[PDB]
């Protein structure tokens, strides 16, 4: 039959979100397929390291492990279920879109229901993990806050067992260290935004990424567990010199177990969370192959011989798609276009991250999109992807050209002592003014999300340049005929002028404060080995200015890369008069990063 132009669209919708939902659920599964073996190795290692040493019967290492774990199987199942639940409630708070708070109120009042579910599940499950680890060794722990101490009173001629009532030292140590685990884990996630996914800046294969992540998580867990452990044991040890005037060596032997258990819990949470980041920030590919394919993972051997029979294979494939009741899809680009036009910021960031793989490294996908313009089709997908970039420069511009006086009049038309204590204590502990301007916060809210726009800027310039580099002419005269160099440079000049303006306007608000000379506590940071891999490829940056450099150094580079390849074919006639001066500054190289 025909299919209608709308039935073909409907088939492409019911294929596109299906393949995305299958990808989202497969990718979620792949994290646990890697995390559960790593967990089992750690639980086996801890079940060995905190077994008492066996007597000299030749019982194998495996038969000792099966006899410690065999008594604990239900607790191991509960522990794995808790690690699955804290993976699901972590994934339920993950984003690509960032939110900046304009004040210390929103950092707690904007926490939507999944964040409150994540907080409550951590507050309940991280103490239960610590209790299970204290339940593995044959030294019985107790959660009684009191113990009966039966000492033998040799003042009588029958030595009476005399039972007097001590407070359980190890219960108060356990409660204080449960609070230490929950508060440090939650503070880090909401202060560093370890739910906004950091996309890797290079296509390094996931086995090397995971090898790096496990090494970085090892040291970061080692020093964070060490500081919680030594600060807790030192403050609590001073309490024993005050109250009991005696230092019982059993405290040290409990403390050395406590550190190994807080270390394990911190490493397990960091390894779970950063495996989601690696697996969801992995570049997808949007082609007719990846969407129309059936996963038939078995026939690999027969590819070699078929090259010489092309037209009869095309006729047989047409007879096959009729038997499949599939429409043909002549537009090989449609699934990349639907990724770019996606109302899911993870799918759009992956769409632009595939348009960036097309534009630099995928010549046959480029030559397809180039010919999509010489086939004189009603609206070619290059111009449709340029529109979602024109749209996204306007969608950013209208949130930067918003006057300061709107925000400062909003501050004119809208507890207390505890909050002023908390702020003054946080500024002291953190090396941050938790003292805010709304205008500088929402310029940061706009700019700190721009990683889609930085990749569309990289990609359209890379695609234009990846016509001229082939010794090609057809694509170059098509690019000029559709005014594609102009449409890449006009909005990019205009929003760069706005950002060479707003860096000056906010410069007068940026005191070189003699403490913003950021000694970012190098004592604690380098007495730890917390040589942090620098926060998440834009964390919460402490000012607007580093975001202005991040936009300008992409834009001013991609302009130079187009003009130093094609800027002698572009006539200034094809620009607005206001941009003819701007075009010549950029053509002559007469520009820098900072005015």
């Amino acid at each position: 039959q025909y299919f209608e132009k709308q039935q073909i669209a409907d088939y492409i919708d019911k294929t596109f979100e299906k393949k995305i939902k299958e990808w989202k659920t497969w990718t979620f599964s792949s994290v646990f397929i890697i995390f559960l073996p790593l967990l089992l190795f750690q639980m086996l290692f801890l079940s060995f390291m905190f077994s008492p040493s066996p007597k000299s019967t030749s019982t194998s290492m495996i038969s000792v492990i099966l006899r410690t774990t065999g008594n604990h199987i239900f607790g191991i199942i509960l522990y794995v279920i808790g690690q699955l639940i804290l993976g699901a409630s972590y994934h339920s708070i993950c984003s690509v879109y960032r939110q900046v708070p304009a004040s210390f109120k929103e950092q707690f009042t904007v926490l939507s229901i999944p964040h409150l579910i994540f907080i409550t599940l951590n507050t309940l499950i991280q103490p239960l993990f610590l209790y299970f680890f204290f339940s593995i060794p044959l030294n019985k722990f107790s959660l009684s806050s009191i113990i009966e101490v039966c000492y033998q009173d040799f003042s009588e001629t029958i030595p009476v067992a005399k039972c007097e009532l001590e407070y359980n030292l190890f219960f108060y140590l356990f409660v204080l260290s449960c609070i230490g685990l929950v508060c440090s884990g939650l503070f880090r996630i909401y202060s560093n935004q370890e739910f906004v996914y950091s996309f890797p800046k290079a296509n390094i294969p996931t086995f090397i990424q995971i090898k790096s992540m496990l090494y970085n998580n090892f040291w970061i867990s080692f020093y964070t567990s060490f500081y919680l452990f030594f600060l807790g044991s030192f403050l609590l040890g001073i309490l024993f010199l005050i109250l009991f005037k005696t230092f019982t060596i059993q405290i040290l032997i409990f403390s050395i177990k406590l550190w190994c258990f807080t270390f394990a819990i911190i490493f397990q949470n960091l390894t779970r969370n950063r495996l989601f980041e690696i697996y969801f920030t992995r570049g997808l590919r949007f082609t007719l192959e990846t969407f129309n394919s059936v996963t038939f993972d078995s026939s690999n051997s027969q590819q070699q011989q078929q090259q010489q029979q092309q037209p009869q294979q095309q006729q047989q494939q047409q007879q096959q798609t009729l038997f499949d009741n599939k429409p043909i899809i002549e537009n090989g680009s449609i699934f990349l276009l639907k990724a770019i036009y996606s109302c899911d910021p993870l799918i759009q960031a992956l769409g632009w991250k595939d348009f960036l793989h097309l534009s630099k490294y995928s010549q046959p996908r480029r030559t397809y999109l180039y010919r999509e313009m010489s086939e004189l089709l009603d609206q070619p997908s290059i111009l449709k992807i340029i529109r979602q970039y024109e749209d996204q420069i306007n969608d950013l511009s209208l949130k930067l050209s918003c006057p300061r006086e709107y925000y400062e009049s909003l501050n004119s038309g809208n507890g207390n002592n505890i909050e002023k204590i908390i702020k003054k204590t946080l500024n002291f502990i953190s090396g941050v003014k938790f003292d805010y301007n709304l205008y500088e916060c929402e310029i940061r809210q706009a700019l700190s999300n721009t990683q889609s726009i930085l990749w569309s800027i990289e990609s359209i310039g890379s695609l234009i340049v990846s016509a001229q580099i082939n010794d090609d002419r057809e694509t170059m005269e098509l690019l000029h005929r559709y005014q594609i160099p102009q449409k890449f440079l006009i909005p990019l000049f205009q929003i760069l002028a706005l950002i060479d303006q707003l860096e000056k306007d906010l410069s007068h608000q940026i005191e070189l404060d003699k403490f913003t000379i950021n000694r970012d506590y190098y004592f604690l940071k380098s007495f730890s080995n917390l040589i942090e891999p620098p926060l998440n490829c834009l964390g919460i940056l402490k000012t607007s200015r580093p975001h202005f450099r991040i936009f300008k150094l992409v834009g001013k580079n991609m302009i130079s890369q187009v003009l130093e390849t094609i800027g002698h074919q572009i006539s200034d006639i094809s620009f607005p008069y206001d941009l003819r001066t701007t075009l010549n500054s950029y053509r002559n190289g007469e520009f820098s990063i900072y005015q």
């Binding site: 800046k201 290079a202 296509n203 294969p205 007495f527 040589i531 580079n557 820098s592 900072y594």
Partner: protein
């Protein structure tokens, strides 16, 4: 198989003897002269334009307010000494290398010292615009701007003089290919990025910039340090947004996002002794110990292919389209076609030229009292450079144990890449017993290729290679 070519051995009979010099390539030759009054007019005119650049041996004498590091606290000096204690423990837990080979492992430490002790360390051109950055003995960098497309008038050009407290022991320097102006400088403190303004290079625009009333510059020294990675070599991406960094002591490439200032680590056993990115393409040369690799940057693999090398040193250059790669180590230059079908096979070998330690017999005419100086040439290669036009390769040597003048000569080859690949020597550039530190071509020269040569005495000199184009 591909054979060992000695095409260098035929043309040794062109190497200017005694008080002769060779002043440039002319009508596809490198003929020799004692005197510049006897040059062809076409080359004499170019040599009246091409001013010799004498660099200063000076120290940048520290002023009062220069941005001194916040003198590391008693606890940061404890942290440095404590990490040096942990690393000296890790140098005991590193398996001790076979010191039986000291006689071929004391060279590189003295190659490093020889770099730091010279008047000129490193010189680096921008690949499109005529900017020459040069590092002196004292880690002062002089940047020369050259507006004139034929270099007329240059006799009073004052260089932009870049120095900073952490600019100490410079090892390597590369410009960012695309603008705005950015210079990467590898040092003992990591890497400096000078992010540079136009008004410190065009003094004319320093009348029209609004900062003129304040006289201040926006030229700023940013820093890409990762702790305990010493950058011994650096190269920028084919799109200007990333920097690939190499160390002789670390088994990794350190690859930076220069926009968001984030480091990434790519595993490289035997370390990095050389890095070179393809000037238009997603391909990186990495040499380390006695292997070279060519990486596909779309995947960060090298198809398991390791290219073998003769010495622990390597030098290399792509051509101006980045289709081909030259790599030299020992008596030899390997020429690889990277861009073909061959990239699935990790690039293919096309040619092997062989600079052995060959000999002249000086053809003694009847002046029967003159010293019969046995000249020897070629041997171990010190640097190669390919021209932007892809038609020339410039090659300099180390001192062979037969010849005192073996680094006073630059060997020039002509290359053709289509319809078949070939190399043909042309002769030897020499000035009168000045020994060479480094070589580079100059960007966007019309009349053929323009070669710049840096000498151990503090001079950079120019040698036009005038191409006989046809009408």
């Amino acid at each position: 198989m591909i054979e060992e070519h000695n095409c260098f051995e035929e043309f040794i009979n062109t190497a200017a003897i005694g008080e002769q010099q060779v002043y440039g390539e002319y009508k596809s030759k490198l003929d020799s002269f004692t005197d510049e009054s006897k040059l062809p007019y076409e080359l004499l005119l170019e040599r009246k334009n091409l001013v010799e650049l004498k660099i200063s041996d000076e120290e940048y004498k520290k002023s009062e307010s220069a941005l001194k590091t916040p003198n590391p606290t008693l606890l940061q000096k404890f942290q440095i000494n404590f990490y040096q204690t942990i690393e000296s423990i890790n140098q005991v837990f590193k398996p001790s290398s076979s010191s039986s080979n000291q006689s071929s492992s004391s060279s590189s430490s003295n190659e490093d010292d020889s770099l730091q002790n010279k008047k000129i360390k490193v010189m680096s051109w921008h690949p499109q615009h005529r900017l020459l950055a040069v590092c002196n003995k004292n880690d002062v960098i002089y940047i020369y701007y050259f507006p004139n497309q034929d270099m007329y008038g240059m006799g009073n050009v004052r260089p932009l003089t870049l120095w900073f407290e952490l600019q100490s022991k410079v090892y390597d320097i590369q410009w960012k290919p695309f603008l705005p102006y950015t210079l990467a400088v590898a040092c003992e403190n990591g890497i400096i990025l000078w992010e540079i303004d136009i008004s410190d290079l065009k003094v004319e625009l320093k009348r029209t910039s609004p900062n003129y009333r304040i006289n201040q510059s926006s030229t700023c020294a940013n820093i890409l340090n990762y702790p305990y990675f010493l950058s011994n070599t650096i190269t920028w991406s084919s799109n200007g947004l990333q920097l690939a960094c190499g160390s002789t002591n670390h088994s990794s490439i350190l690859l930076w996002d220069v926009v968001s200032r984030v480091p990434t680590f790519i595993p490289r056993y035997n370390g990095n002794s050389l890095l070179v990115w393809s000037p238009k393409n997603d391909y990186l040369l990495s040499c380390g110990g006695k292997t070279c690799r060519i990486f596909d940057i779309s995947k960060w693999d090298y198809n398991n292919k390791e290219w073998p090398m003769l010495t622990n040193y390597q030098t290399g250059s792509w051509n101006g389209k980045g289709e081909y790669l030259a790599v030299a180590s020992g008596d030899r230059i390997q020429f690889i076609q990277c861009i073909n079908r061959a990239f699935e096979s990790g690039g293919e070998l096309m040619y092997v030229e062989k600079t052995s330690t060959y000999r002249l017999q000086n053809v003694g005419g009847s002046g029967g009292g003159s010293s019969s100086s046995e000249l020897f040439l070629g041997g171990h290669i010190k640097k190669i450079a390919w021209s932007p036009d892809s038609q020339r390769l410039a090659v300099i040597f180390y001192l062979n144990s037969k010849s005192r003048n073996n680094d006073t000569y630059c060997a020039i080859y002509k290359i053709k890449t289509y319809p078949k690949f070939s190399v043909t020597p042309r002769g030897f550039i020499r000035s009168k017993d000045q020994s060479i530190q480094s070589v580079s071509f100059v960007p966007n020269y019309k009349k053929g290729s323009l070669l710049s040569i840096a000498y151990n005495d503090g001079t950079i000199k120019f040698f036009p290679l005038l191409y006989q184009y046809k009408q």
